[PDB]
Paper text:
Non-structural (NS) protein 3 is a multifunctional protein that has N-terminal protease and C-terminal helicase domains. The NS3 protease, a serine protease, requires NS2B as a co-factor for enzymatic activity and folding. The NS2B-NS3 viral protease is responsible for polyprotein cleavages between NS2A/2B, NS2B/3, NS3/4A, and NS4B/5. Due to its essential role in the viral replication process, NS2B-NS3 protease is an attractive target for antiviral drugs.
Construct eNS2B47NS3Pro had seven residues from the NS2B/3 cleavage site inserted between the NS2B cofactor and NS3 protease. To provide the structural basis of the self-cleaved eNS2B47NS3Pro, the crystal structure of eNS2B47NS3Pro was determined at 3.35 Å resolution. Using molecular weight analysis of intact proteins using LC-MS, we identified the presence of a second cleavage site at 3 amino acid upstream (K128/T129) of the conventional NS2B/NS3 cleavage site (R131 NS2B/S1 NS3) in eNS2B47NS3Pro. In our structure, the NS2B cofactor adopts a new conformation, where the NS2B C-terminus is not fully folded back as β-hairpin. Instead, the NS2B C-terminus occupied the active site of neighbour NS3 protease in an adjacent unit cell due to the presence of the C-terminal NS2B/NS3 cleavage peptide sequence. In the current structure, the cleaved C-terminus of NS2B (126QVK128) enter the neighbouring protease unit via a side tunnel and occupy the active site of the NS3Pro of the dimer unit. The occupation of the IAQVK peptide from DENV NS2B C-terminus is mediated by interactions between the P4-P6 residues to NS2B 85SIRD88 and NS3 155VT156 residues and P1 K128 to NS3 129DF130. As a suboptimal substrate, glutamic acid and valine side chains of P2 and P3 from eNS2B47NS3Pro are rotated away from the active site. We also identified a small hydrophobic pocket that is exposed only when the NS2B is in the partial closed conformation. Hence, the structure reported here is suitable for co-crystallization/docking with allosteric inhibitors.
Author numbering:
A (entry chain B): 18 to 180
B (entry chain A): 46 to 99
Write the structure that this text describes.
Amino acid sequence: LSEGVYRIMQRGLFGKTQVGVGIHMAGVFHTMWHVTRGSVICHETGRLEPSWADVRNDMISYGGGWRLGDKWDKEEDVQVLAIEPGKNPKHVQTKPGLFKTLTGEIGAVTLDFKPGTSGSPIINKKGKVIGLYGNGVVTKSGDYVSAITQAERIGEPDYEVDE
Amino acid sequence: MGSADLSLEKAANVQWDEMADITGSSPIIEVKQDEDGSFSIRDIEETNMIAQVK
């Protein structure tokens, strides 16, 4: 109900385990698709129902559309508010790379946090979320890289005069 | 009704920590492509190199 970063826990035989991370901002809970896979999330106040998802980009919103509009500007340092399971929140800053793919260029974060951090917010200097950590790629026994997962501007040139 | 899947636990708020470490800040360029149902992803790092003799 309150704006902030939330751990997404799943009750099991041995209690609740953090399967991912989500951000509630402007009244909508934003997280990754592969984390919750559409399952409703309940809290003291009540149960959250999904509203929008993008399985190709691994994103899902609860209680409304994607309100995180701030995207990453190229050649700007970002911070990942990694919520590792059990451990306290940890802030790490990095200079993102690029994901050269058809349909656009996505920021490439080289930080390799522990599993379960999928959905950790990626924050710009202005203190606003510009992406989500979790969906990325691993090398042959090498350093995991996560894409700055953001909803809008997934295929736009980001240099035109129209909007 | 009756169901139960996943709960929430707040951990932090969106704030920029200026004292965060900047280690591991590789601006790698990753070319992802697919040809025949598989996906081929190469990562090109561009590390800086100063000349040195032996």
